[PDB]
Design a protein around this nucleic acid. Sequence first.
DNA 1: AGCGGCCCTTGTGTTCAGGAGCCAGCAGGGAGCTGGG
RNA 2: AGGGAACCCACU
DNA 3: CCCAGCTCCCTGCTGGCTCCGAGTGGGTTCTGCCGCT
Lengths: 97, 120, 209, 189, 244, 192, 314, 117
Amino acid sequence: DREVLRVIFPTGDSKVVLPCNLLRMIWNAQKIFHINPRLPSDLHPIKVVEGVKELSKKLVIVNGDDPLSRQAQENATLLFNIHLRSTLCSRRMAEEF
Amino acid sequence: RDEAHKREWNLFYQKQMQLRKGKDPKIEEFVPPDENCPLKEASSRRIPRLTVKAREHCLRLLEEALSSNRQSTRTADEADLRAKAVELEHETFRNAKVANLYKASVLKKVADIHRASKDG
Amino acid sequence: DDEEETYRLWKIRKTIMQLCHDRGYLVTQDELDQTLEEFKAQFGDKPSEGRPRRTDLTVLVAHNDDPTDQMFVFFPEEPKVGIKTIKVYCQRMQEENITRALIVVQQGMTPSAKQSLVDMAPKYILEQFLQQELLINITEHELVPEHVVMTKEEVTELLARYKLRENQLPRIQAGDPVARYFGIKRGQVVKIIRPSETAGRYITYRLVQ
Amino acid sequence: QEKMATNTVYVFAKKDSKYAYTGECRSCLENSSRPTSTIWVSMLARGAIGQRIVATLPYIKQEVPIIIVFRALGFVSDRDILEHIIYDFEDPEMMEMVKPSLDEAFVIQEQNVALNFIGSRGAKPGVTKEKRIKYAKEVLQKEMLPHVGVSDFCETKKAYFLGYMVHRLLLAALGRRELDDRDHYGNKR
Amino acid sequence: RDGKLAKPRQLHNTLWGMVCPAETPEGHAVGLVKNLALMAYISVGSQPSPILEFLEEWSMENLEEISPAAIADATKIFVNGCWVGIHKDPEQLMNTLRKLRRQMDIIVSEVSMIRDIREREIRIYTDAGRICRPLLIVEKQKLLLKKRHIDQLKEREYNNYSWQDLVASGVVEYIDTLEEETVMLAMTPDDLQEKEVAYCSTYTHCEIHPSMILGVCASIIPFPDHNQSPRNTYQSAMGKQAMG
Amino acid sequence: NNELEPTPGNTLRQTFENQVNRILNDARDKTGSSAQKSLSEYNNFKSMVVSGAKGSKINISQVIAVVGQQNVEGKRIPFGFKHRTLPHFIKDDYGPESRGFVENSYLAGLTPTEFFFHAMGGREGLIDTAVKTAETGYIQRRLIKSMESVMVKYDATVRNSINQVVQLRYGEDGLAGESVEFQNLATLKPSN
Amino acid sequence: AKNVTLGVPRLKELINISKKPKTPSLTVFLLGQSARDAERAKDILCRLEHTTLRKVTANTAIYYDPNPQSTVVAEDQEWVNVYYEMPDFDVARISPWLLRVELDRKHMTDRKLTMEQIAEKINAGFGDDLNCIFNDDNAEKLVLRIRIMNMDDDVFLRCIESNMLTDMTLQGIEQISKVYMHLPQTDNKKKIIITEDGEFKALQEWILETDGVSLMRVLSEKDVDPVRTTSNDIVEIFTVLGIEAVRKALERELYHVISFDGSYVNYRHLALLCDTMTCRGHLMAITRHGVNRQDTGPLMKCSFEETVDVLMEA
Amino acid sequence: PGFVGIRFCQECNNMLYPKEDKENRILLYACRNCDYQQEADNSCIYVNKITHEVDELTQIIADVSQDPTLPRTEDHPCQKCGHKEAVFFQSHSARAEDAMRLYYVCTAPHCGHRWTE
DNA sequence: AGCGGCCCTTGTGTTCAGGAGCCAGCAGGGAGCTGGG
RNA sequence: AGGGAACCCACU
DNA sequence: CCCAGCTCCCTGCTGGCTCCGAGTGGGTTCTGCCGCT
Ligand SMILES: [Zn+2]
Ligand SMILES: [Zn+2]
């Protein structure tokens, strides 16, 4: 995804326009559930990766199981999926959020 | 627009040249160089309207320039004088493609050699 | 005037090789990655003197799908290409059982010659290129996105998937620089992949008209 | 109501046109139902050989070379016309600038021929040369520069003022005088 | 109003004193409809016959009598756009004409006389529609207006000393734009005072008051020089809509 | 004294004008910054500027510091008269006052020539408004009539009245514009 | 430096698909050493900007010279007799009318031109029928003597001069009137690369800004980047690169116009406008001509413009 | 060399054009509508000053010393008569890009000397 | 009583929103082909 | 049951 | 076996047509008449 992004944005501008404010959603989740950053968390990182995969499968812009619809769906949400994967990392979920 | 006016000039110029040009081009047959010609590629006709005798004269001027350079710097060998002059003439012919430009280049080389001799 | 012409010929040959490779013809890697020194070695270095001669640059390539399909790329010497040279090229193609050819002219081509090219389309598909156009590869410009030619099966799949009619797709002119580069005629559909700041990637289809 | 001042020579430049520089004078008599007669003296933009000065007169639908106009007024010799146009004979730049106009007008060497030429350009040229000359003379007497004079025997004053207009055009073309401003008050009444 | 060019609608430099800079409609007719300044006067016109008679009586040489060789070093003289002759001493001719106009012996106050020094033309205008304004005369860095003139003006109700007496005693002068191009105005008499580095020191006229450049509607604004100019234009537009 | 040499891409007059404009703009900026520094926390100009309710720092500078330079068509006040901006100056005066530099604040008040030059400056903007209105209005109508019938269809494509495909997905991603937000990609800039 | 049209005028130039923009320009990026050092950048600039003979000439003068052996100028006579050593030519085929052209040393050194190149261009444009002779550069003045080899010859030489000054090109491309050269101060024009450490870096490199548009010739030039070199004229982009290239370039120009003031408009609106303008394979101008040529319908068209004409055709 | 003037015929006062005597090969100035000829001396028949290096002092007239709107300086005395005051102005003429140069004219009524520094 | 007929004053006569982009028609130029020598 | 055309001024 | 017209296409200019922001509030003047059929 990093290589794909560097190809898409040849310059060094990382400001993009995307639907969901993932950082603010994580902040809201931290405030709602009283997350203590100073204690170990009970979130299995494999849980994080599996959840991200299922979520990515749940966000469809071009529906259809044929190869054309599959490729169009992958293209439509490519940038948002890259953002989601790089934000909902197992490592970031463990040591940052 | 500009190109149209340009070709306007072109048609005027060509008809004026024809008015100033003879009906038949009186082609003066190229003079074959004498076997004693020290000019490389003396039989070439690459440069139009250039005579072998003109090349011989240019090589003679190069010879005089080299002689002046030698007497100023006291060059030892003499055969080198002739070889260098012939090489210079052949190089000038190879580079230039028009008689007037050829003559100008030869004169420029002569001036360069003269200045070098003056420097010592 | 002598090295400049050799450089121009090398650039034209490199662009033609890239075009042929992009069209699906079998071109070796050395031909694509040929330097100016290699061009001066294989060919001449005094184009005005006649070495190399434009007749010496003629290149024949063969399609990967079937070796029978071959394409010429002729380099006429005359600045303006008339009917007689087109007739000579057509005679050579008929003798050699070739169907496609590319003509890279220097200054241009007569209107009658263009009409002749158009007339015999169903028999001999031969195209026309200005060497000023082939001095660079337009497909490498940052503005030009990735163009691909869709096979009839792929176009049928596309129309079935989107329930479209060919006249409902966006259009690309047959005289478009990229259309000429890929040699796509009317009725063919071209797929265009381009980056997108909103979606990441985007594929759009254009019908050649 | 604002209008542009009359009887004053204005030189404006319009490079998006056929004329590089264009003089202008809205000559109007002291009192007359006839509106102001506008005369132009314009220098052709480069692009034959030199730059030719033409004169656009009222009731003539084709621009005529200035030297033809000066000959129609009764000044045939080049010396007299240049005396009326170029006041300093030791300034060769103006002479070089005016040479093309003299070259343009060489076949027409007499007043009657010039009048016939001017009449031929008229709106309604007559098949008879006499009536064409009559029309041209009438136009020059009454329509060209009314403010200078409308009666007869005013040819010298007309020639002097037209030469002054040509001189102003030449000065503007040579860069010796700034072009007039259309928004400048004082050029307005 | 259809034309969208901004040049005719712009406030030209020459409108100074003649036309109000502020008052103008802000709609489609912005800059095309203007208003006179307070002291601006538009001339009504007069016959050039007395001026031509004086010039002929003067050293001026007719256009017909002269020879073309004499025009190179001579000064062309125009009267209402008619080249009437040439002269040899433009400076003293202009001095005489200015003296006559100030005395009003033969030239009325409305006549505007412009000498183009770089060129060699003297243009005399007696036409109508020439907007002008009155300016004080300065001779040698001193106003011609004195304390006695003000003393007489203070009693105009009794001694019948009006503005026409100022204009007739050569203390004030009507200047139009063409002639205003050739004058050297002092905004205030302070500019005539000696300075460590004199700016001009050759002033020819002085402003009666710089605030006379405004019109009827922009003349009621208090402290209009402390406001942004569009505000002054808007008030000029709104002073006509006030109820009184 | 012919001791000034033109800069690349410019002529001598352009270079001189650039130097003068640079000097005067720097002076205006410095005086404006000094004006900002002088203000107290109780100042109401600063109160309305800091909150963003109304006004800017340029307004404060003009009210307290110099008003600045008045330009007509992007250049200093032109020589409307013969080599003079007004009949109160000498011929060929390129100084700050002559060409329309206002050194007085609005509180101090403008001098007559400054008042006239500022009036010219304001007239420029008034005309600009009066003309831009119609030009932009025609442009807007033309755009609307060009694109009025394009809409999102039930197959999610964007098509015009003729039912021809304009976009296969709206915005190439098929999302409405009112719900997207600015965000930052965290994997683009970082080094390996 | 160079005036660039922006705002509503540029927007009108864009959506109208004007063929004659007020200020067309190119943005030429250089490839190799030309990008780093300014000398080779200046070389390329001179190779681009048009240069007619009138831009380097000091003054021309048409003399009458009966015998070239003895000319009317002492220095010219000396140099000519140095040149005229033999009857290497045909004496009969010579005209006595000389055209002496004095060039400008400053301009020639600025363009790195020489008498040899000018003589070459004169010969190419006029052929061998003329005769041009030039002195050495080390001389005090740059002088060229032109004659016609054998309507009068006088006016003929005058016309030859009046043409040579203007139409003849010594360097550059015809339609490029001026070419500025500068180092960009903003990362939008700087060369962005990804270092060996995988981090973005912005190299500063010389770029050229032309005043005309000859995009094809400029792109084909050596030492000119053909990947990043672009134009602000969209008709030229369409003619040279194509419909997708002009789509992207039109979007770029619209974004520049809109965001020059710092304002933001969502990308999808610009994308939709550009798609509508380029969906049919040609530049559909946002005008009566562009819009009413579509296959929309007479009632659709009549509401826009040309009501009665549209309905009469229908 | 400089710009070439124009000569007028002695019998008709019309412009004389350059021509060549074929047999003698000498430049003549011959009238076109008459049969008059004159001997040319300069031998230069045309001049074009592309640089336009015109000495603008030739375009200045001492009359400008009477202009009240021109600035006057006492630090640039005139060399001819030693007067201390002079009016200074600029080129203000087209065909001069480097037109910030100052030209001085003596204020003395009779001197009228024009110079440049 | 109502139709002829319109006055544009120069029947010959100044600008009836004027200028900017598209489209259409005319004349010129040249490529190529074909009937005579 | 009832109008219109033209022009001018002005407001946002 | 070339020469010189003639046909057919393409170029360039020149001439003509259409368009020129959205609403709103006031006001005044004018929408025939004159000769003799
Ligand atoms: Zn004679
Ligand atoms: Zn003196």
